[PDB]
Amino acid sequence: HMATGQDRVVALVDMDCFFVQVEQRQNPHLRNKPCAVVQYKSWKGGGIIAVSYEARAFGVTRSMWADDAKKLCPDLLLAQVRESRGKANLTKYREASVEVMEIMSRFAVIERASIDEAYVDLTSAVQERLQKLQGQPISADLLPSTYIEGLPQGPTETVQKEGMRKQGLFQWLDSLQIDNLTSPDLQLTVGAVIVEEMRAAIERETGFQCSAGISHNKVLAKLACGLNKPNRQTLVSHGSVPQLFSQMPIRKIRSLGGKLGASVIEILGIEYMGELTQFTESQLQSHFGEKNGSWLYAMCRGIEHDPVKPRQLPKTIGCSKNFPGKTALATREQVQWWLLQLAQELEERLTKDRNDNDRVATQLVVSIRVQGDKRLSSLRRCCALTRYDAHKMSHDAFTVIKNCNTSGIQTEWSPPLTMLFLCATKFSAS
DNA sequence: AACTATGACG
DNA sequence: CGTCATAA
Ligand SMILES: Nc1nc2c(ncn2[C@H]2C[C@H](O)[C@@H](COP(=O)(O)NP(=O)(O)OP(=O)(O)O)O2)c(=O)[nH]1
Ligand SMILES: [Mg+2]
Ligand SMILES: [Mg+2]
């Protein structure tokens, strides 16, 4: 079924207001209330990085200053991200993420895509389940939180959302050919049943709720996941794609949210994903390149082949700190102190990684930014990471960046640094 | 003065 | 290898 891109069953599971749930689980007083997670509190009340659905009802969003959020939502409750060594420490959320990833890993191969989401390749699990209870009809009861995108439709409770969900689910299940084990639609349905079980396990064992998308590829699975958030899952069939894409803004598709998506819209003079079908593969390749052109040609038809990579661990482990405006580091001692702070956090995380995952990083990347520099990185350099020693890593990091200081004065450092980034990479087994 | 992963290109 | 893109 590869020709039509119906060869696999892929899901994307994403936690609902993740950081907030983590804080709510720990502090019961925050449950079922407009709440948000904030980083730092000194500048404009701190930056919001997560928002409960109750808070979103007031217009509160990520990236908003807490002071501004309070203007929209006076009774907004806030949880502060932990600070260690003068910077944000996200260990609590990383540990919570592990809880969830470990549960998902029981059901199938997963690809960690973020701190709060992972792709699941359910093709094999579906096949196994299909042979079990073969020929047995699938009850609506097995899909208590599933939406079938595009349904209900046609002539024939619906004014309310749950009623709408049920009607669509009934139409879908009624039309399913259960006797053909090879049917893509049947395979998606079975995948949805498994995902219901996965999400139940996650909630029962962690207390966290999540949403999911089930489809034939990662892009459609990700898109589907967001259609009925929170605490719901959505199945997007191959057949639902034409109508779904007909009014779907191009920027909403994974990897098209940036410049490429903007160029597709501007160069082609179109707004929705579906409009891409009128162009030949060659035409798209001419405008956007061989790889991008082929990808777009297939994608607008609901077809994509990016595999769910069997990777549950990060390929890099890093620490970074910004020093905006007048806080830019202007002294040798300051720069050295901050490098040590980052190096110490990095050392802790690395040591844990080595113990937990039987591997060691072999390269240390040092990135900095100087004030007045438009570029994200004024300098990027590497050196060998031979030992998990904060002092050595900090000293080595300083050695590689020290020549960027142009100040004659011994004490002073210029131009001022607005960012420091230490990253461990090139992991090897041990 | 948003703050603290992966992948493709050349 | 370093940069730029995309992103939660
Ligand atoms: N520091 C920082 N953290 C972020 C940012 N974006 C997301 N996070 C962190 C905080 C988030 O809680 C977590 C998950 O990211 P999502 O899945 O994108 N959002 P959530 O789960 O919150 O809500 P829902 O999915 O229901 O819409 O990652 C950011 O720009 N900056
Ligand atoms: Mg989420
Ligand atoms: Mg997410």
Tab-separated table of N, CA and C in Angstrom, chain A residues 32-98:
chain	number	residue	atom	x	y	z
A	32	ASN	N	-7.071	21.960	38.037
A	32	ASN	CA	-8.330	22.470	37.503
A	32	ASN	C	-8.463	23.972	37.674
A	33	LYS	N	-7.366	24.690	37.491
A	33	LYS	CA	-7.402	26.133	37.633
A	33	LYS	C	-6.595	26.778	36.547
A	34	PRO	N	-6.814	28.073	36.300
A	34	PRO	CA	-6.005	28.745	35.297
A	34	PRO	C	-4.614	28.913	35.865
A	35	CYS	N	-3.665	28.219	35.282
A	35	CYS	CA	-2.302	28.193	35.787
A	35	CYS	C	-1.300	28.180	34.642
A	36	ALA	N	-0.082	28.598	34.920
A	36	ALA	CA	0.964	28.575	33.919
A	36	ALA	C	2.319	28.379	34.557
A	37	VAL	N	3.248	27.862	33.778
A	37	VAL	CA	4.604	27.697	34.245
A	37	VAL	C	5.460	28.825	33.726
A	38	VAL	N	6.204	29.455	34.618
A	38	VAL	CA	6.999	30.611	34.264
A	38	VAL	C	8.479	30.402	34.568
A	39	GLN	N	9.329	30.996	33.736
A	39	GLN	CA	10.775	30.931	33.872
A	39	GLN	C	11.326	32.293	34.316
A	40	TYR	N	11.901	32.304	35.513
A	40	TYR	CA	12.390	33.521	36.123
A	40	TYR	C	11.217	34.415	36.538
A	41	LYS	N	11.444	35.373	37.423
A	41	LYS	CA	10.349	36.201	37.874
A	41	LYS	C	10.724	37.657	37.908
A	42	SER	N	11.987	37.924	37.711
A	42	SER	CA	12.480	39.325	37.810
A	42	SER	C	12.018	40.242	36.657
A	43	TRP	N	12.142	39.783	35.403
A	43	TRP	CA	11.791	40.646	34.268
A	43	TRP	C	10.338	40.448	33.824
A	44	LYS	N	9.499	41.449	34.112
A	44	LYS	CA	8.085	41.444	33.735
A	44	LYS	C	7.348	40.222	34.271
A	45	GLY	N	7.742	39.765	35.456
A	45	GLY	CA	7.056	38.648	36.081
A	45	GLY	C	7.528	37.302	35.570
A	46	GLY	N	8.439	37.299	34.595
A	46	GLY	CA	8.952	36.044	34.067
A	46	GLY	C	8.266	35.613	32.783
A	47	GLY	N	8.924	34.730	32.036
A	47	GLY	CA	8.371	34.260	30.776
A	47	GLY	C	7.558	32.981	30.925
A	48	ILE	N	6.342	32.998	30.391
A	48	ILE	CA	5.460	31.833	30.428
A	48	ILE	C	5.860	30.816	29.364
A	49	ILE	N	6.006	29.550	29.757
A	49	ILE	CA	6.396	28.528	28.789
A	49	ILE	C	5.354	27.408	28.674
A	50	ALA	N	4.376	27.403	29.576
A	50	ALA	CA	3.294	26.418	29.532
A	50	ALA	C	2.023	26.992	30.144
A	51	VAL	N	0.868	26.650	29.570
A	51	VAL	CA	-0.388	27.231	30.013
A	51	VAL	C	-1.507	26.185	30.102
A	52	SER	N	-2.201	26.146	31.241
A	52	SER	CA	-3.330	25.239	31.398
A	52	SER	C	-4.458	25.640	30.462
A	53	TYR	N	-5.298	24.690	30.092
A	53	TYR	CA	-6.388	25.003	29.181
A	53	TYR	C	-7.353	26.025	29.789
A	54	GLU	N	-7.475	26.025	31.115
A	54	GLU	CA	-8.317	27.019	31.768
A	54	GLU	C	-7.766	28.422	31.541
A	55	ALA	N	-6.441	28.544	31.583
A	55	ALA	CA	-5.781	29.825	31.367
A	55	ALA	C	-5.885	30.257	29.906
A	56	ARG	N	-5.811	29.293	28.988
A	56	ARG	CA	-5.908	29.608	27.566
A	56	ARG	C	-7.250	30.240	27.234
A	57	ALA	N	-8.272	29.888	28.007
A	57	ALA	CA	-9.603	30.444	27.809
A	57	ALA	C	-9.592	31.960	27.986
A	58	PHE	N	-8.599	32.458	28.727
A	58	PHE	CA	-8.454	33.887	28.987
A	58	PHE	C	-7.536	34.550	27.961
A	59	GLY	N	-6.925	33.744	27.099
A	59	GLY	CA	-6.050	34.306	26.084
A	59	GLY	C	-4.579	34.209	26.455
A	60	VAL	N	-4.269	33.562	27.577
A	60	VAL	CA	-2.887	33.397	27.992
A	60	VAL	C	-2.162	32.434	27.066
A	61	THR	N	-0.943	32.786	26.679
A	61	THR	CA	-0.184	31.953	25.760
A	61	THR	C	1.257	31.852	26.175
A	62	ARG	N	1.939	30.890	25.596
A	62	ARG	CA	3.366	30.756	25.788
A	62	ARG	C	4.096	31.944	25.172
A	63	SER	N	5.220	32.311	25.795
A	63	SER	CA	6.081	33.391	25.335
A	63	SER	C	5.618	34.746	25.861
A	64	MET	N	4.523	34.744	26.587
A	64	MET	CA	3.934	35.957	27.117
A	64	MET	C	4.539	36.253	28.463
A	65	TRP	N	4.768	37.522	28.772
A	65	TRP	CA	5.292	37.836	30.101
A	65	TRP	C	4.217	37.609	31.157
A	66	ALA	N	4.609	37.093	32.323
A	66	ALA	CA	3.640	36.815	33.384
A	66	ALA	C	2.837	38.068	33.755
A	67	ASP	N	3.504	39.219	33.795
A	67	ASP	CA	2.821	40.465	34.127
A	67	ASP	C	1.683	40.743	33.149
A	68	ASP	N	1.930	40.470	31.872
A	68	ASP	CA	0.922	40.669	30.840
A	68	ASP	C	-0.170	39.613	30.937
A	69	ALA	N	0.226	38.388	31.265
A	69	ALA	CA	-0.731	37.299	31.423
A	69	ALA	C	-1.737	37.619	32.524
A	70	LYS	N	-1.257	38.256	33.592
A	70	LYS	CA	-2.105	38.619	34.724
A	70	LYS	C	-3.154	39.648	34.321
A	71	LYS	N	-2.824	40.467	33.331
A	71	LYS	CA	-3.762	41.464	32.832
A	71	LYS	C	-4.981	40.793	32.192
A	72	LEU	N	-4.736	39.703	31.463
A	72	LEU	CA	-5.808	38.938	30.822
A	72	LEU	C	-6.517	38.044	31.827
A	73	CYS	N	-5.735	37.466	32.729
A	73	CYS	CA	-6.241	36.532	33.724
A	73	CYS	C	-5.737	36.903	35.116
A	74	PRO	N	-6.504	37.743	35.827
A	74	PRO	CA	-6.162	38.221	37.174
A	74	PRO	C	-5.891	37.094	38.181
A	75	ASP	N	-6.648	36.003	38.089
A	75	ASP	CA	-6.528	34.923	39.070
A	75	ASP	C	-5.558	33.828	38.618
A	76	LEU	N	-4.758	34.120	37.602
A	76	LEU	CA	-3.792	33.150	37.086
A	76	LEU	C	-2.814	32.701	38.176
A	77	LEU	N	-2.690	31.388	38.355
A	77	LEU	CA	-1.716	30.838	39.288
A	77	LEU	C	-0.432	30.497	38.553
A	78	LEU	N	0.705	30.707	39.199
A	78	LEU	CA	1.972	30.482	38.523
A	78	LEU	C	2.865	29.528	39.287
A	79	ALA	N	3.521	28.660	38.534
A	79	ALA	CA	4.535	27.766	39.057
A	79	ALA	C	5.874	28.119	38.437
A	80	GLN	N	6.899	28.298	39.263
A	80	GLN	CA	8.196	28.720	38.748
A	80	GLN	C	9.085	27.545	38.427
A	81	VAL	N	9.756	27.624	37.288
A	81	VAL	CA	10.748	26.639	36.943
A	81	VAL	C	11.909	26.722	37.929
A	82	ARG	N	12.378	25.577	38.388
A	82	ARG	CA	13.470	25.527	39.350
A	82	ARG	C	14.725	26.195	38.803
A	83	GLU	N	15.464	26.851	39.689
A	83	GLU	CA	16.720	27.477	39.317
A	83	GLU	C	17.873	26.866	40.087
A	84	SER	N	18.915	26.501	39.362
A	84	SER	CA	20.127	25.957	39.948
A	84	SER	C	21.340	26.539	39.260
A	85	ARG	N	22.349	26.899	40.038
A	85	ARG	CA	23.569	27.455	39.470
A	85	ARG	C	23.280	28.697	38.631
A	86	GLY	N	22.320	29.504	39.084
A	86	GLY	CA	21.996	30.772	38.447
A	86	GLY	C	21.193	30.627	37.167
A	87	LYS	N	20.620	29.458	36.871
A	87	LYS	CA	19.872	29.314	35.630
A	87	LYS	C	18.715	28.351	35.779
A	88	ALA	N	17.857	28.340	34.773
A	88	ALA	CA	16.732	27.433	34.748
A	88	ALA	C	17.210	25.995	34.713
A	89	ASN	N	16.599	25.177	35.545
A	89	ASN	CA	16.881	23.754	35.623
A	89	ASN	C	15.603	22.967	35.350
A	90	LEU	N	15.600	22.188	34.276
A	90	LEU	CA	14.384	21.505	33.824
A	90	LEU	C	14.374	20.032	34.182
A	91	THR	N	15.128	19.657	35.194
A	91	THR	CA	15.237	18.252	35.559
A	91	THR	C	13.873	17.625	35.878
A	92	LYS	N	13.017	18.360	36.575
A	92	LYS	CA	11.716	17.821	36.956
A	92	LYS	C	10.918	17.372	35.737
A	93	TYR	N	10.929	18.194	34.693
A	93	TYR	CA	10.169	17.910	33.483
A	93	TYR	C	10.818	16.800	32.667
A	94	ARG	N	12.146	16.726	32.711
A	94	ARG	CA	12.848	15.659	32.010
A	94	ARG	C	12.554	14.307	32.653
A	95	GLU	N	12.500	14.285	33.982
A	95	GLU	CA	12.190	13.056	34.697
A	95	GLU	C	10.750	12.624	34.436
A	96	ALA	N	9.834	13.593	34.403
A	96	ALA	CA	8.443	13.281	34.085
A	96	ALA	C	8.338	12.718	32.672
A	97	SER	N	9.091	13.311	31.754
A	97	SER	CA	9.106	12.850	30.373
A	97	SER	C	9.540	11.387	30.289
A	98	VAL	N	10.546	11.017	31.080
A	98	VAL	CA	11.018	9.637	31.099
A	98	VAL	C	9.904	8.679	31.525
